[PDB]
Structures are given as C-alpha cells and as structure tokens.
Design a protein around this ligand. Structure first.
Ligand SMILES: O=C(O)[C@H]1O[C@@H](O)[C@H](O)[C@@H](O)[C@@H]1O
Ligand SMILES: O=C(O)[C@H]1O[C@@H](O)[C@H](O)[C@@H](O)[C@@H]1O
Ligand SMILES: O=C(O)[C@H]1O[C@@H](O)[C@H](O)[C@@H](O)[C@@H]1O
Lengths: 598, 598, 598
C-alpha cells in the first residue's frame, strides 16, 4: 500500500541501477523462447530511466506495438544480505513484468506510480540476470484509456497492423519511465509515515500541533538548518511548535522529521500548511488564494516521458520568472523528485490520477449493434473503475505528506454528464476523501459541453475545474462571439456558490508565425485569445484560478490537427518563450498569491 | 465577345491608370447617398491594381462583407476625341459597377476576366470623376461558389454578422485585381484576331500553313528579330512558311504578326505548335509529352490576388531552375501578362475557368427539409451553368492564340459523380470544343472519391486530371497503406485507355519543422510523401503528368486545418524553397520533356 | 593514477548521489564565514549532475564569476564500514574542493576527468554534511585556457566586473558536470586493469593473444552471451582465443573479462581490434579505414555540459541513421558512459585532451611592454604544460582499454607553428606514446594558417588533422576561389606521405533560412560548401577522413559572430536535421568503412 521515497540514510542503502541496459523488441516470440531465461541475443542498447520511443530511428520502432525487453545484470555482496533487499521501480509504463534468473518475481499494472518487490529470496550469489518486460498496449481496461481509432477522428484506419490508438491527446511514451533503484533496510523497518497538522490562527503568533503515525512491519524534529527543537517516543506522537513558519506559496519552509525506530531510521521533510474551501474562496493558510500557472506534461526531448530533473529545475525557474504559483499534473502523477522539489521551491500542485480517456464520445465513438455504446455501458464501456481506485489508493499513499499537494483530481475530461457517470465517480470521491489524512479538496476536470446542471462534478467536487476553449475549437477565429459564449456559461457556473478555476485554455501557436492583423496559429492570435478569456475571468469573483494549456509544446499522436504535436504551449518544447509567455508574465506580476479579488 | 491585349501601337494609345486611388468601405448607405456622384469624403487610400484585403489593419477591414468604392479623376485632351476612347478593366473581383460623373456606364460579373466600355459619349471635358464599386459577395450564383459555412466543417457559425464563406480553399481576395487602362483606336478598328496552324511533319524540314481571320467593326509576318518574310491582303488570309521553328516546351519561339487595316494596326506574337491526344500519349508537336510542374495561385504578399509581374518572372525563373515545364491556372484564369510571358519563356499552361466550388458535398452540405440538397438540385442547388458558359466564352476568346495554352479545364473538383453532373457539363464541354479554333483537349479536375466508372469526366474529357491525397488526407501518416490504395485506384483508371495526370497532390509542410523519424507537417514527411506517390506514378505508362500542389504557400480562410494558410507549397509564400523543392529539382532533372516512358 | 569505471559487482556497492542538492553562489565571503561548516542558509536548489549555468534565470547567474557551493547530506550504515568507502567524482568543472563536516578532504584541478577520495576516516556516524565548492575561473594556467577578452575580438571590454573570457569557442559551462557516486571495495582490492591484444592475421581464421596486468593494492573470460571459454591465475596472464570476432567499426563485439582476486572482483568489457599507421593508409584490423563523422560537443539543453545518456543514445542512433562511423571528443574527454556506449555500438572515437586555447594569437592577442606576447613565452605565455601532462596521464589511464578509442589528440588548434611549439609538445607526445599500452596513433588538430613546412605536427604526429574553413571564414561567399585555395594547401600536405583527415569544416547555418540562389547562413549554402570541400577531398588518396563541424548547434559566449551560439551543426541543438544532414547521409551511404579509395 504505502511507499516512502527511497533516500540514503543511516540504516538503508540506495543503489541506482540507472545506466545503459540491454534492450530488444518482442517479435512476439519473446515469451515462447523464454528470453528472460538467458541474456538477450542481437540486443540493442537503451538508457534507463527513459521512454524508449524517440531513442531510435524508424516508424516501426517509434510506433511499436506490444512488449519490449530490458535486461541488466546485478550483484550484491553478502555482508548486507543480513538486511532486506528491495527493488523500487519508480514507474514502468504501462505494464511491467519483472523476471530474475528466469523466475517471474513481480507484476504491475500502472505506468505512473511506484511499486517494489523483495529480493532476499531469489537473489543467488554471483551475477544475477535481471529482466524487465514492458508492455504498451492500451484499451478499455487501462488508465489512460486506449481507443479503437484516432482521437481526433479523413485520417487513417484502413490498416490491419495492430496499433495503439490513444483516447488521449499525448504520445504513448512507454518503457522504464522513472528510476529503478535498489535499497536496503533491517528486518523490522519503518514502512510508512503519516503527518497531519492541526494549526491555530487565533494568536498573532500562529502555533501548530503535528499528529503523526509511524506504521512498522524516537521521533526527532529539526527545522530548516537542523537546529533540533522537540522529541517524542513511540508510534504514538504529537509535536507542539510555536512561531511556526507557515509553508506558503512561493515562500516555502520545510521542517525536518527524523524517525529513529531501533535498527532503522528515515528522515521526511514536512511543511506546515492549511487548506480548506469556504463557499467562493479557496483558502490556503486561511487566506484567499488564486491559482496562476498551467497544465504541464512530463515531456522533454528525447527522454519522452522519462524523468528529467534538469528540466524540472528549469521549469521551476521559468515559473518563478513568469510569476506563476501552481500547476496540475496533467494527466498522470509526476515523479517523486518533482513533487519533493515543489515542496522545496513552494509551488502549489493539483495532483491528478491517470484517469484520462474515460470518455467514449471522443473519436467517432465505438459502435456495437449499430447503436453507439455510452461511456459507462456495463458490458461494452470502460472497465476501469476497480483499477481506477487502486490508482487513487497508490497516489494518495505516496503524496499524502507533500505540502505542495493542495487538491486531488479524480479524472481529466471524463464523460461526466452521461448515464452512469455519478455511480462511477461517487465511490472514487469517497475513497479519495476517506484515505487522505488531511481531507483536502477533490475535483474532476470537466470536458467542454458540460454545464452546471448536467455535470456530476457539480455535486461530487469541492472545486469546479473547467477545460474551455472559447476562441479556439469553439468560436475561432471570432473572439467576440466566443467572449459572449464564455461569459454565458461562466455566469451559469456561479449558480453553485463553489470555487471555479480554468485548468486548461489555450490556442495552438507555431513559434515564428506572426501578423499585425492576427490569424489563428500566430503568436498575436494566442495573446488576443488569452486577453479575451482573462477579461471574462476577472469579472467573476468566484473564479479562483487560471491555468493555461499548455506550459510547453509536447508530442502527440500524428493527426491532421496536430502540427508536430500539441502547439498550445506558452513555451516551445525546448522551453523557449513565445510572445504569450511575456504577456502572462506581465499579467501575473500584478496579481498576488492571496486576496486577488476577495 | 473578343478582347485583344492592349499595347502601344502606331494607331492606339495606352494610358495606365494604375496608382493610388481614393477608397472607402460601403456602410452600406453608399448607394442611397449616391457616393458615386461626388468625390468621396473621409476616404482612405488604396493602390490599383491590388486586392485590398491585406493593405489595411483590423479583422473588420480584411473580412469586410459587401461593397467598396474606388474613385479617381481622369482627363483627356480633345485632340484625340477624334479617336474612340475605351476603358479596359483587366479584372475586377468579383462584381464591378463603373460610374462616371454619377452615371452608371457599365456592369460586369466575373472577377478574373477582362471587360471594356466605351468612353466617347459620357466623357465631358475637364476633370471627370471615375468611380468603381466592387462587390465581394459569393453564393450559389457566382463562380467561384460561396457556401453557407466554413469549407472544412467545432469551428464558428454562431454569428449573425453577414459573412462570405468560400466553398473553396483560398482567400476571397477582392478589389481591382488587375490593371485599369485607357486605350484609343480609330472608328473602324481591328476588334479580334484569330490564327490557327495546319502544320506538316511529313518532311525532314517541317513546313507550316497559318490560317487567320481578322474581324473588324495588309497582314505582315516578322519572325523573332523582325526580319520580314511574307505578306497578304484582306481579312482573308494564309501564310506558307518552311523551316518553321516549332514553339517547344522550354524552347519557345514567337513569330510576330503585323496587321495593318487602314487607319488601325495591331501586332500579335504567335507560336507555331501542334497538340493532339492519341490514346495514352499526350502529343505536343507529334511527340509524347510529360507534364512537370504544379498548380499555382496568383497569390503574393501583400498584393493578395493582385497582379505581380516581378513575382511572375521570378516564378518562371524558379521553374526553369527546378526543371519544370508546366503549371495549371488554379483556380481561375491568370493575368494576360503572365500568359504572354509563358509564350516568351515557353511554359506549358493548363488554362482553367473560375468553376471551383460547384460541389455542395463540401462542408456539412446545405440542408432544406431535413434532406440534404444535391449539388445539381434544380431548385436549391448551384445556379451557375449560364454564367459558367460566359466564362468559357470570355476565356477562350482571350487566350485562343497563346501557344502556351495546351488544354482547357472546365472546373476544379466539381461533384462530377453525382446526379445531374453529366447534363451540367455536357453543354460546357461542347461549347469548349465549338469555340476553340485549335480544338485543343478539354478536361475537368476530379475530386477525391471519384472513380473511372462514376466520373462524368471519364466520358466528357480527353484527359483525366486527378486530385489525389493518398498519404495526407487519406492514409496519413501510414504511407505504405496509402501506397496500396493509390496503386489500386490508379490501375482502375487505366481502363479508359486515356491519358492520366495528377494535377494536385501534396502535404502541408511548415518550413522549419524537421525530424530524422518523420511525422506529418515536417519537411521530411513531405519528401517521403512525394517519393511514395511518384514511385506509383512511374509504374503506369498511361500517366503523362505530375503536377504538385502547391507551388507556394498561399492564404486561405481561417480554420483549424489551415496553419496560417495552405502550407502544401514546395516553396514558401516568399518563394523560398523547402527541402522537397530540391527533391523535385533532382527528379525532374532526369525526366525529359518528351518521350519519358513512351 | 588509474581509475576503473564504478559498477555494481559481487564485492563492490554503488550508491549514486545524483539528485537535487542545496546550492548557493559565493558572494564571495563563502570561505571567510566557512559555509562548508554548517548547512547552507538561503540556499537555492540544483540538480546533480548538470552544469548550473542555464538552470536559473538572469545574466548574473548565467555569467557568474567565481565559486558556487553544492551541499548534501549523506549517511552510511556501519555494517559495511568493514569495507573501504570511496567517493568518485566523475567530473567537476573546473576546480573542485570537497569538504566534509567542515574538513577539506580533497582538491582537484581538471573539469573533465574523474578523481576519487577515501571516506573511511572522516565519515563519522549519523548524518554527515557533504559540501562541494566549484570554481569556474579560467586563465593562462587552466585547460581549457581563459583569455583577457572575447575570443572573436567593436564588442565589449569596458567593464571592470571580473569575468571569464574563454579563449575557446564554447560556453564555460561549470558545476558538477558528471555523476558523484559512492562505491565500496575490500581492503586489498583490484585497483587497475590493463589488456593488450597481439593478434594474428596470417590465418584464414584469425587468432588473438591477450596479455593483461592486474595491479592490486583468478581471471575469467566470457564472450558476449556469457559462455565461458578460458581461465588463468595470477596478476600474470595471457589468453589464447581462436575464431576471434574482431571488434569492427559499426559491427562491435565485446568479450567479457571477469577478474576475481580474493575478496574483490570486477568485470571489464573488452573488444579485440588492431590499429596501426602505414604511410598513407590508416589501418584498423589491417584494413584501410576512412573516417565518416563529426566533431561533437557534450552540449544539450538545459543540462549544459552535464551528462545526458538519453541524448548520447539518440546521437548514436542518428549517426547510424546517417551512416557515420566516428567522431572526436571536441574539445575535452567525454563521459565514461559515452565511451562504453561507443564500445557496445561500435563507433570509432578520437579521444582528445582539454588542451584548447593554447594559442595566444586568438583575440587581439595579449600585450606587455607594447610588444605582443607569443603563445609559449616563458614568462607571460601559457603556464599549462605540467597540468597538460597530468591530463594526458589521467585520460589514457581511464580509456586505455576502450576498443573504440583509436587515436589520441594532444590539443585542439594550438599555436603549433610558433616559437616554442616543438619544445612544448615533444614531451607531451612522448608521454602519450610511453603510457598508452597499445601504442595507438597520436595527433594534434591544426589551426588554419598552418602549413606542412611550418607545423610542429608535421613531425610529431602520426596523422595530420586539419581544421580548414575554405568557403566560410576564408573565401566565403566565393566557393570557386575557396576551392582553389583548398586544393593548393591540401596538395602541399601530401608532401609528408602521412594520412590526412579534416577534423573540422563547416558553415554557420540557421535552420529555416533558404534561397534558390544561396547566400551565407542558408541551408543551401551549407550544402554547397560541403559539396565543394568534399569534391577536393575525393581527389587525394592520402586523405583518410572527413569529420564535419559540428554535429549539432551548441552554445557559445555572446558575440556578434555567434547567432545564439555556434550554428555550424548538421543538426539543431535539439537534434533535428538541417538539409545538409540528408546530403551527408546520401554521400556517406555510398562510402564504405574500409577500402574507400585504397
Ligand atoms: O486539444 C487540446 O490541445 C487539449 O484539449 C484538452 O481537452 C485535453 O485536456 C488535452 O489533453 C489536449 O491536449
Ligand atoms: O486541401 C488542399 O490543400 C487543396 O485540396 C484540393 O482539393 C483543392 O484543389 C485545393 O484548392 C486545396 O487547397
Ligand atoms: O569557428 C568555429 O565555428 C569553430 O572553429 C574551430 O577552429 C574550433 O575548433 C571550434 O571550437 C569553433 O567552434
């Protein structure tokens, strides 16, 4: 269930297996001939961690369907076999199968959340052959959802070759996305840590009480520099600090927490912060917040979706340069390292599950007996709800302690106004609120066409998150008519007395295209688009956030509607600014983190 | 009916009125208040000749609906009022209304063909106020055809503001497109000239007999330098030359023809050339030709569709640099000056009418009583056939003598496989063959989806001209499956034993986008697309021409499918080459004008 | 002296400390206040490994002068304190100072070669504060060499702010460039391994004898799959294999070598390959080789010079796509991981030292008493020779075993035709040949202006490596006059009877700029430039290699001559191909690895 971020400590090791592994594409006789038994023959090379799709040439490699085989030898000295040996795969996209010496030790479904296995038993001495098989197939049983044709459906479709058809607007990057590490710990070890914060704003000098639980199978506090200030015994626990330095947006502070438990020990950074909804206002530390930022992607060249800590730091630098304060993990949980970095740098995050494409109205829509099948058809619709809960389980269990995480997003653009939607999401929202020890807000990001009266989010969600494209897909290029439509729908959303924020809005823009009299796809049109939208946003005291789509240009599946990927970014794929980036920087510079329009 | 190209001669003048005129947009009280009576107030400035759409700023100006008013004063001395004064408007797009001193002297429908009026009667002495009103409205009665919504129909459509919606894929550039000149001539004057060529290939030294007619309301021959070689009297006439220098593709020769007729005289360049179809082979001068070139547009910045002789010469230079030999006047007759230039430089031309958009299946298709209305519905379909004939009349009457003109194109992508198509085009083809004194081939350019069995062009046309996009709109990005489909349809077209040529095929390509593993919209994909198509072309001895679409990027109406216009050009809008331009140059360099695959 | 690549084995661990460390810029009171003692206050964040220059915003950060402070806590359990604890800094650019708990444990000069220190003594238990201070200052004592003004010297120079002025044409990326890892090993351990190959081509089935030495402070062989085939005892040693699979260019093979030595063990991949010079011919495995490739940079966004294994694999993929076979480590030794990858993928490498900028004629040239100071002036010239030898020592000691390494490059563009040049390089070449157990060729890359009679490389070097820009800096834009000059100088180089190869030649090209009639900086001009140069290369049987400059666009110091960096790449900085990339791919496809022109 629970997984702490591995890190070197007094009692645990940490051996990063990152490097160039052996690699081979399934053909698809890989399992018949038991390639996991022996070392791979005719193997190519492949770095880890990284999506493999862009690291070789040819459409057959990039658009490969099925399995790939990673392989690498490992070896451990016996003088720590006394300890337990565990293998943490930070992420394998999508479906992983971990062999060792030819024996299937582990399986996992879920391309964006960590999972571990124990190695003490099957780790013979000498050099041991580790093989990881990675599958990329997506369908009605996976999150994200795979369709039956192109999402934008002219086009293709006449081919019998088996192919993935994403029901989502990003490229199906697969492989060992995130680091594969080996760490140790003593039999009887700290397995999970939880920390909540009851805090007091009555006083001019805010105090805070920190409850904690340390599941296991001394607790020291430290502040930034490491000046110790408190101590307690047992899995039991509480701290009383006065003169709390509140973790703030763009003004972070992380106390340290040292938990020694006999033969084992682990340190956890924690930020003291409060967040709660109050009618219109979205309060962080009992102050009226306003989101400024974007929906992002873990998308870089040529790593694909592979983790890129240099870019993560560069993205933060650009955000603080642009006077942003937040972003959403579109459309999947990001790496642990990026989440911890957001703690250090003080960026508000909207952590989202992998639940994109739970909407069978995209594309032409799948068909059965002539009839079109609704999204939540129990026999021919999505088969994802049970896996959907495991994702909510594993996600909250991983990022429960992050001060940056401010709200959970159950799904991106699901068919939330259709038959079966409420019964699908009600158990998910309930599980979301039951397992989050901090009871933070929950939402879902609403596709276009949704209204206040028809959205199951109008009831289940604490915050309304809209993806609206008035002036692009709907109204472009007449920004005046689009303005009227945006004001009309947005007014209707004020009926709920709930906070509203736009998590996505943008216009495809090819860096370099200009005109004094703007047309679609030019940098001028992009600025005018955001001008019109932001003008309507500023009219409604109940909109509490603007998040542009996207932060940067990113790769998608090929289609007539995608000009070498999605070009809605404020920055290019190599993080160079378009003209709209300087527009938002000037606008966001005058809008404060708190009390924008109260 | 007939209109000769005005040019300075011994008996006629030529006063180009080109310059900066007064200009004003209708609002739309222009005719109520009789703005044509007085000089215009609050007028802006506008050069002539030029499309006005891109010469000012603001969407309201560029997307203006309705009328505009040009105005300019003229004056003539009396010492040539003895002569007749005629005003030749080379082209006014679309509908022109010529006032003078407040009196409506002329009207014209047809935005791409010349028309004149006589000035002797209403030309008082002193300074006379000339006003031209230009209308841009397009609908089911105009050629090109105006629709009811965007041609690519997400989008727009919710606006009540009256707007043009082109049923064609280029921008509705309007205004005084081509020069407005004043020339003289004596009462009793040469009105029309016609020259045919019966020529003899029996001998090792080809001789030629030139019949001519000189309609009127001495005939001298001259060769290139001006060395005279023959003479004849009367409207009657014939010439017998031996050692003819045959006008060839990329090797032109223009004899001169001086026709003195009493008080009047006119000189006409003429090239001696033969063209006839023979089963598979397209013969020019009894040799098997092969078209190499493009579909072009009269499209430059910022002239819009306005005439641009510097670019016309530059385009020819680029064609001869690229080893091309031909192009089509997509999708309207081009300027006279460009046609005469093609005579001098020796470029084969496929002269096409303004009949684009005669196809109501584009867009969503217009609706009536729930029913969709077919293209040639007699009550709710196109109302263009009678105007369509006037266009065929005026066009052939203008370019009957050009040696470069090798074939006529009745329409671009009409609904030629629908009910009513044959009865619509049969009288048009008949008029085309009846009025062309040289009886040159006639065709229509067939939309995609057309087959040999279903196309009314399979019967009416001497040459089959296809617009196929296997590997772009149909099959992209799988070029292998697209190849199979292209070979399958092309084989079926060989059933007719007629010549086949592709007048359009291409892929949108944004100059600058590259990848080693190509995706759509990159320069690499564009090259691979043309490689696949050209490979299939070379397999069939009955394909006699490849014409890429387009020659250069050009402006279109705004839509999600158009990245700042149509990007299918081999060159950018400013005539800079994409990578595919060097590919075609290398391919066309090894393919000869004659006897490519015989 | 000797350093083996750390990797997990039966007896050693490997704990990658890569991650987000604490970071702070010196101001420059860092050492006065002993920031290394305590944890850093007001610290920012910084990932490791990566150059820090592009990971924050502002010119002051990017152009920082002096020191920066990395900091991170580490902890080790006692149950392996029995082993020795060593800290391998793969590279710290330029000058590193490693504190721990406040004590200076190590120092290092050399920004591109590894160095380690032992941790057993100063590693108290608990959490231990590790601090690394990095300096970026460059001058006449460092390799690469720092100047006194801009290398291209209009410009700047009027500022008193202390600044680095690279005497080289790449950006002064600094910080922890390459991974910082911790590995273990038993007291008494394998410290160094050396393997040579005496091999026999007499027989139709080539056999090979492998001598080896295992310095220390059982030996098993294995072949690709791991099928064992031989064994020997002692530091003593030899192997006799028959049916050797020769490591070939673009056809690699790596036998494995397992050396168990009591309590310790290490595995080394080795490729059996021969290389020797023979008059004109450059022989690899007794066959006449021909280099096809580029000079590269370890340069990516935003890592700067930081190691990027995803890009390294992508670069190899592009090379094999382009039909290249080799590259040079311009202008510094690359990462170990890239060298091992070249072993696996079979790319020929020209390993080069950090000796760039040993040439004081660049810029305006430094001045003293009015006099200009020559490069090797003993009082005011370069002070680098002794450090220069340590670089040759550490480099060969690291890459002595790589089969890909085929030739050593002592320096890039030194003032090799000046007074003092011979006495400067003679001891360096001697040290190069003395310490390389395989006695592979040695060279230096000759600046433009050098001739056969004036170059000290004409004598000291086994291969002549030229950097010539006929048609760019010299002759551009007249490629005809430039051709004459290139043929004239190249003919004169044939006087030596030695092999000649061009290690650099190119023309700055901004991706997107085109013209049918080419001008400098367009993609067309770049192709024509390489066409002219390659035409002259093919005329001389003694030129054995063409290596273009550069592989990809890369960052440089700002100057009027650098359009956002060096644009001479065949690919863009994000590895997208320019038109010249497809030219070289077509040319290199017809040129074989061996026997091109014999
Ligand atoms: O069309 C777009 O650009 C985007 O539209 C939104 O609905 C999706 O959230 C996003 O994944 C797409 O990339
Ligand atoms: O889609 C395209 O690029 C083109 O398709 C063809 O059918 C039309 O002839 C042309 O007008 C369009 O511009
Ligand atoms: O001028 C250039 O582009 C290059 O010239 C060469 O002499 C240098 O080796 C290289 O560092 C420069 O980048």
């Amino acid at each position: 269930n629970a997984m702490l971020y591995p890190v070197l400590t007094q009692s645990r090791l940490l051996s990063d297996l990152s490097g160039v592994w052996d690699f081979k594409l399934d053909n698809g006789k890989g399992f018949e001939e038991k390639w996991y038994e022996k070392p791979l023959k005719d193997a190519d090379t492949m770095p880890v961690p990284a999506s493999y799709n862009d690291l070789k040439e040819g459409t057959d490699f990039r658009d490969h369907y099925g399995w790939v085989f990673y392989q690498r030898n490992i070896s451990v000295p016996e003088y720590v076999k006394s300890q337990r040996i565990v293998l943490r795969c930070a992420a394998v996209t999508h479906y992983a199968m971990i062999y060792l010496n030819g024996k299937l030790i582990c399986e996992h479904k879920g391309g964006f959340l960590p999972f571990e296995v124990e190695l003490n038993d099957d780790l013979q001495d000498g050099d041991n052959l580790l093989t990881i098989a990675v599958n990329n197939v997506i369908d009605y049983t996976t999150l994200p959802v795979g369709g039956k044709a192109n999402m934008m459906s002219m086009g293709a479709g006449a081919s019998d070759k088996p192919q993935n058809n994403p029901n989502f607007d990003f490229f199906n990057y697969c492989g060992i996305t995130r680091p594969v590490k080996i760490y140790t710990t003593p039999e009887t070890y700290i397995n999970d840590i939880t920390v909540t914060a009851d805090i007091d704003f009555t006083k001019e000098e805010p105090s805070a009480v920190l409850n904690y639980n340390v599941e296991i199978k001394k607790v020291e506090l430290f502040d930034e520099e490491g000046t110790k200030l408190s101590e307690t015994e047992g899995s039991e626990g509480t701290f009383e600090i006065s003169n709390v330095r509140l973790w703030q947006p763009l003004n972070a502070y992380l106390y340290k927490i040292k938990v020694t438990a006999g033969q084992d020990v682990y340190t956890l950074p924690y930020g003291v912060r409060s967040v709660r909804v109050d009618g219109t206002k979205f309060l962080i530390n009992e102050k009226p917040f306003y989101f400024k930022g974007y929906g992002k992607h873990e998308d870089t060249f040529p790593n694909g979706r592979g983790i890129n800590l240099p870019m993560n730091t560069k993205d933060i630098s650009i955000m603080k340069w642009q006077h942003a304060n937040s972003f959403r993990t579109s459309h999947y949980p990001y790496s642990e390292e990026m989440m911890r970095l957001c703690d250090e740098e003080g960026i508000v995050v909207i952590d989202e599950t992998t639940a994109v494409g739970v909407n069978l109205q995209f594309g032409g829509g799948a068909n059965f007996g002539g009839e079109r099948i609704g999204t939540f058809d129990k026999e021919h619709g999505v088969q994802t709800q049970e896996h959907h809960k495991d994702v909510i389980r594993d996600l909250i269990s991983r990022d429960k302690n992050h001060a940056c995480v401010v709200m959970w997003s159950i799904a991106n653009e699901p068919d939330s106004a259709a038959e079966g939607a409420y019964d699908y999401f009600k158990p998910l929202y309930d599980l979301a609120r039951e397992l989050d020890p901090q009871k933070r807000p929950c939402t879902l990001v609403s596709v276009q066409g949704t209204t206040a009266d028809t959205d199951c989010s109008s009831q289940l969600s604490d915050v309304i998150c809209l993806n609206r494209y008035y002036g692009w897909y709907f109204g472009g290029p007449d920004l005046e008519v689009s303005e009227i439509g945006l004001r009309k729908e947005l007014s209707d959303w004020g009926k709920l007395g709930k906070p509203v924020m736009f998590t996505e809005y943008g216009a495809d823009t090819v860096s370099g295209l200009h005109d004094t009299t703007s047309v679609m796809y030019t940098e001028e049109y992009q600025v005018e688009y955001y001008e019109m939208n932001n003008k309507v946003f500023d009219e409604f005291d109940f909109v509490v956030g603007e998040q542009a789509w996207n932060f940067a240009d990113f790769a998608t599946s090929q289609s007539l509607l995608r000009v070498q990927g999605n070009k809605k970014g404020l920055f290019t794929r190599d993080r160079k600014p378009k003209m709209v980036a300087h527009y938002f920087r000037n606008r966001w510079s005058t809008i404060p983190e708190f009390g924008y329009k109260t």
